[PDB]
Amino acid sequence: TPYCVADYLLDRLTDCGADHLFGVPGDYNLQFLDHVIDSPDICWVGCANELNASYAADGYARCKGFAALLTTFGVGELSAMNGIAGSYAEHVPVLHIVGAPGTASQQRGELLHHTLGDGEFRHFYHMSEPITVAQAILTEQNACYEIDRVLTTMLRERRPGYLMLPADVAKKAATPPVNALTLRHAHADSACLKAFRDAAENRLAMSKRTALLADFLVLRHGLKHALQKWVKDVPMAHATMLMGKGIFDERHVGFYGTYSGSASAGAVKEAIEGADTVLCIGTRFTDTLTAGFTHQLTPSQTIEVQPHASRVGDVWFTGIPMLQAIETLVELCKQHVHDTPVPPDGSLTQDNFWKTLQTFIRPGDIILADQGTSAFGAIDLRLPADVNFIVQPLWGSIGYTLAAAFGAQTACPNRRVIVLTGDGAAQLTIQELGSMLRDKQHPIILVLNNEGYTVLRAIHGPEQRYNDIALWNWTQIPQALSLDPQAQCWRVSEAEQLADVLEKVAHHERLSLIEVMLPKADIPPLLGAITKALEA
Amino acid sequence: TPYCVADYLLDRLTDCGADHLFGVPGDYNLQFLDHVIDSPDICWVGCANELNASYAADGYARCKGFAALLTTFGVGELSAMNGIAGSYAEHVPVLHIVGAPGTASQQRGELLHHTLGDGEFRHFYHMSEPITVAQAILTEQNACYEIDRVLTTMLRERRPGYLMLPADVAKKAATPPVNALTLRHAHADSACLKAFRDAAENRLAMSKRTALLADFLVLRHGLKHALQKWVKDVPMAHATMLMGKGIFDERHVGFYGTYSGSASAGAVKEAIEGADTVLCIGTRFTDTLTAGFTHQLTPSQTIEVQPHASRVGDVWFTGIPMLQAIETLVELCKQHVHDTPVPPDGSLTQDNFWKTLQTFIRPGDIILADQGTSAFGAIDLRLPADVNFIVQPLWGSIGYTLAAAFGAQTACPNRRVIVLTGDGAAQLTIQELGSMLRDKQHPIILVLNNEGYTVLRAIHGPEQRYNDIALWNWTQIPQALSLDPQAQCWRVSEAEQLADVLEKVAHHERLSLIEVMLPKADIPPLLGAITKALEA
Ligand SMILES: Cc1ncc(C[n+]2csc(CCOP(=O)(O)OP(=O)(O)O)c2C)c(N)n1
Ligand SMILES: Cc1ncc(C[n+]2csc(CCOP(=O)(O)OP(=O)(O)O)c2C)c(N)n1
Ligand SMILES: O=C(O)C(=O)Cc1ccccc1
Ligand SMILES: O=C(O)C(=O)Cc1ccccc1
Ligand SMILES: [Mg+2]
């Protein structure tokens, strides 16, 4: 077992922050997998299918800052394509490793399984190009520096990378690196940073009341502490949108709720949109996050910070890392901003479900909500400290949440994971519940059983049959997907029942599946406003 | 509800042979779905996820000659990418309809859900290019003739097509066609056909023993009957490979078993490879079908017929329809082939499982086997007449078989569907069993429970844990995926038990799940030949 390219890739994987490898085996990656098994730093996590494996890696990377997925050539990598695209859309650094046929087999154009039968072995590599920031076909002549380049770009951009690893390449000799891969910090040209600073100070110095709006790019680049630190030194009205929920302790002074554009609570609208200067840190104003682009923030009202560029008014200042832009704004805010922010009983409904769940969440929770009433209702939760809130509203792929929960629980085995998934969403990735059971995880899974696609019903054709789903027996699923499930399940239809059951499960001693019976047409407040804005 | 582009697409869809549309709804395709619901000719089939929906359409198209899949922009189409690629690889005409945001939203580059957040709406259209034979972005200015062009190319090439249907384009006015969409058989230039006939006539005239080898491309282009009649009218040693199994009634004289390169029964090798002239009709010599490319067929020994070109010896004759080449060769065989033929108890094992199943299959059966010991064992079955044998050994995506069975059973509600899936494979697409139960289908599902990836174990690392799987309670799955599964399930470990159970479920009055307990290391004969031809 001499040190080879496969070992080099695994060593670089640990350098980037991953302690587990998700995926599904195939004959093209079995020999690479031997090095994963033997590795003392990387844990193989076999998944029920590649799409779930890619979802799990995404959720894993949202907890550890990095993740890796292993698939087999063609059938595996294409199954995971939607997950990688979601990681690209929401800036999640998931490394897609594709085990591939040997280079000699590729060069002869053989009619191998997992190919289109045309002897071409680069179709799927090119198909991955739009959803990755870097990729490489690893050869004997490029492997180690291509691995470093892709991972480095992945770390810089916080977005997926792709490596095609032919089985013969994996075995090629390599030498262990003396230093851990860490390309680290970049600094703006001091004149460029000074110009930004000067422009931001002029704007901030003339601001009567400043507000702060941070979102998911703060999370992805590891600036959550800095933003928390920011609001503590510099009290001001602050909020996130749905994607970046969890950046702030929502019980802190100056926080009035999540910002949603026009769908926002009245206090939130006044706190953020009423400020003459709003600092938008890592924000993307997507249709869902702004309830149909109904946000009212003018360019002259805002200072914007993006990963490599920041904007003051109409002027953009490019080639500035967001970290330096934030440090600049923090210093400036300490000088020029002086605001002192002034502070169950019946049939289950969306309203009393979320109120009941609000009393249940605790610090340290990992909360995942899928698209549908789960995410659009969970936006109203008042998150305590140290909560990792995982939602995917830009990509919006239902089924992500259940499989991502498995990755998150793998990342943080000692943290309580709460899964908020619709009945429709859970059908798409249900087989990863077996992975949770196999690995003895103890998530609290709440299935919002409204018997179909309620969000779709609220958008169009509520009585149409395409909005119906096959009606599953949810409390029986753990017993079918495990020979001895360490789990308990309940079906609740009353608010007192749910609160009583949530009381029972509180310290998550086993996996909990709570089937929540909800009305077919019941809608959380945010989604009602999103539907109200969909008309023309 | 005036007639519009959406109705035109559905009208053309029925013309091509699809009576059902598979997929998953999304807000971008709800209004088109109203036309599917309202249509009296096409039935909406909601699926548990898009990947299973694409698998189901593939199996549906293998029974009706055409199929359609409907997904939503981005999250849906990318989830279905592996299914479409498999349809492209094995020449299955599946139409992928992608409901998309309105053109105005696309033109403004809005930050819409199901996008990468870059305002780009053509990434996923271009990613589908390598795995479709034709595509179009439907506009108000091109919709109807782009629809016709894509379907016509699909009909000609027997391969998937792609249509992006912006929600606004679907509502644009159209006129119902007086002529049903059809693609009239091409005709070879009479000199080119004559040149091939004269070269083939010379080749056959000096051949003492001729054998016939047909495979899946015969099935896709609708030449099954032609090959059947050809061997009836001219008896000769004939065979198929694994992909084209089912072309022949395997009980007629001159059929000795499926051809698998070096892995043949002695009679099959002598029947096919021993012939001085072998007619290869629609054959692709992939690694799995040839047991590692160990087939011995020389160019001078073979006459080969492909969809648009045929070969005699070293000379290719292009621009000849496959039908005309066969017709020509049928004429010639009558002229120059003047010849005729040549001359369960105890613990369940792979050997006695397939022996037991051999006595169970009947005419009219639709048999689907997934990659693994299921497909590699089912190759030894001697099929009776009118059997549709669905295997996917070129693409080889496990999980296809279970979801494809749902599509096939939808296609043929009055035929008995036998599903041969491994435990590993069935985990990937298990949620489509709920679709089977919701639609009151009655397949006989045999899950080969060898507790993990046995074929992978036989290839590499039998004791390695990446070849293990989560151990499910298979007979309990219908009770979890339905509120009233009228299903009958058994766990069998004895052959006498299995035969008794197979007698019980023979007339498929209910869905049957037979969990077949097989040894972890038990191997079908073909896979042993595939393993021995590796790293040699
Ligand atoms: C993979 C995928 N397919 C389709 C969609 C379209 N879509 C968006 S919300 C939704 C319904 C979700 O329903 P459910 O999970 O039951 O949530 P509910 O609103 O009913 O609470 C669908 C199908 C998607 N987002 N992702
Ligand atoms: C979607 C997909 N993922 C991974 C593979 C790689 N692969 C090929 S055969 C196989 C084993 C299949 O196991 P099972 O379905 O239980 O059949 P068995 O060979 O175990 O009888 C695997 C993992 C594949 N072919 N398709
Ligand atoms: O291992 C894989 O990638 C498979 O898909 C299973 C397999 C193994 C050997 C030949 C064909 C398929
Ligand atoms: O319908 C879809 O495509 C969805 O993904 C659900 C949805 C509906 C409205 C806003 C965001 C997501
Ligand atoms: Mg629902």
Ligand SMILES: [Mg+2]
């Ligand atoms: Mg198995």
